[PDB]
């Protein structure tokens, strides 16, 4: 068994930058190292084989280098298209073993979110459960805080967040925050508020509605 220790786990770099990903082998692996690029929810594509050879139809921006047990992938001028998780592999011995991977985030200029608040639909109400949905659209970076203010009080653990992958064209993320409340519990309270803090708003922004009222 040979271990491949890939670093860093995750990295941010700006378009045009020269990004460098390392992977160290636990023993001599001679030349038997490959590099893959996996897009969110697709199969890996082979980039570099026998440690240093560019694979068919991969952009010339990608290069590959070996120094003993240390192996290096170098993307010379990072493009938007190169947003992915990247994995070194060794195939010297059996089993062949994959690094933990490194997620390449595109760093861009800071972008406040557009915030929107969505009261339950009338259709969901008549089923006995209510989902208040808060949208934070097209922001950078990914770090954001969302607190719910139902009847002006904080909420805890009655909220689920989900965030999109970095967009191909504008490199921003969107986020969703969904407060789950019983039909009964919901009807009880008047004000429903979604309060956001992000590096690119001066002060925290709150969007709200008053239950039912247009």
């Amino acid at each position: 068994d040979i271990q491949m220790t890939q670093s860093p786990s995750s990295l941010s770099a700006s378009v045009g930058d020269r990004v460098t990903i390392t992977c160290r082998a636990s023993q001599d692996v001679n030349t038997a190292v490959a590099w893959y690029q996996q897009k969110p929810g697709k199969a890996p594509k082979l980039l570099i084989y026998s440690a240093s050879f560019l694979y068919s139809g991969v952009p010339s921006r990608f290069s590959g280098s070996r120094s003993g047990t240390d192996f290096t992938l170098t993307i010379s001028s990072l493009q938007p298209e190169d947003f992915a998780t990247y994995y070194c592999q060794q195939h010297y011995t059996t089993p062949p073993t994959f690094g933990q991977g490194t997620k390449v985030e595109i760093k861009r200029t800071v972008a406040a979110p557009s915030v929107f608040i969505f009261p339950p639909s009338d259709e969901q109400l008549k089923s006995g459960t209510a989902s208040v949905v808060c949208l934070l659209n097209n922001f950078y970076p990914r770090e954001a805080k969302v607190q719910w203010k139902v009847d002006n009080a904080l909420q805890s653990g009655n909220s689920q967040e989900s965030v999109t992958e970095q967009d191909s064209k504008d490199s921003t993320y969107s986020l969703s925050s969904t407060l789950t409340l019983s039909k009964a519990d919901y009807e009880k309270h008047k004000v429903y508020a979604c309060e956001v803090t992000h590096q690119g708003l001066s002060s925290p922004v709150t969007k709200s509605f008053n239950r039912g009222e247009c």
Binding site: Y36, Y87, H91, T94, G101, S114, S121, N138, S174
Partner: protein, 208 residues
């Protein structure tokens, strides 16, 4: 073109059996090793097993040795993975690849190990110079779901959030699109939601 097509994926009970299958096309599997590689939700690639079809010699990762069986058939130019004694740990996208690294990969097949039975989603509107609107796709199992807008006509400014697994064990996500509000009333807005596992199809028209 060289091409590898997986099939046989789907939703199995813990401990159940499921037989994946990898059809090679554009070369002979006599001439190469075939591996299975998988990926758990939001996790790394993990090598599962390999086989040299010519003589059927097989090597396994230790997390599956004795439960999984790899095999091949040169005459059908196809490789197999016989998954037995399945555990929640085995839920993953299973890919098929050949060998001098792994140059061609199949599309992947989703295997989900769970006791939870099939359930179609409920779909609810998110009612709205820019406006935001969308659909709530709630209480379905298993993954995956498909959400289109206006039968695929509308793709600019669309955000279909990854599903969360709720405390119930049922999945939920939200699909939203951003439009000029000048377009409201001029364009009709319909989310198309397809959950093949259930045989569930739903079109919800979203209006203020």
């Amino acid at each position: 073109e060289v091409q590898l097509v997986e099939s046989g994926g789907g939703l199995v009970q813990p401990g159940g059996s499921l037989r994946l299958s990898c059809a090679a096309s554009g070369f002979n599997i006599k001439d190469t090793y075939i591996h299975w590689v998988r990926q758990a939700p939001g996790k790394g690639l993990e090598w599962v097993a390999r086989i040299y079809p010519t003589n059927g010699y097989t090597r396994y990762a230790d997390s599956v040795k004795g439960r999984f069986t790899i095999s091949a058939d040169t005459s059908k130019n196809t490789a197999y993975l016989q998954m037995n004694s399945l555990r929640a740990e085995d839920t993953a996208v299973y890919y098929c690849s050949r060998w001098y690294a792994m140059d061609y990969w199949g599309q992947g097949t989703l295997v989900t190990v769970s006791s939870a039975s099939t359930k179609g989603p409920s779909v609810f509107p998110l009612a709205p110079g820019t406006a935001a609107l969308g659909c709530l796709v709630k209480d379905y199992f298993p993954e995956p779901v498909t959400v289109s807008w206006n039968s695929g006509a509308l793709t600019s400014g669309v955000h279909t959030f990854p599903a969360v697994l709720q405390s119930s064990g049922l999945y939920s996500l939200s699909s939203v699109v951003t439009v000029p509000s000048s377009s409201l009333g001029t364009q009709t807005y319909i989310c198309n939601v397809n959950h093949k596992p259930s045989n569930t199809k739903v079109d919800k028209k979203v209006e203020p």
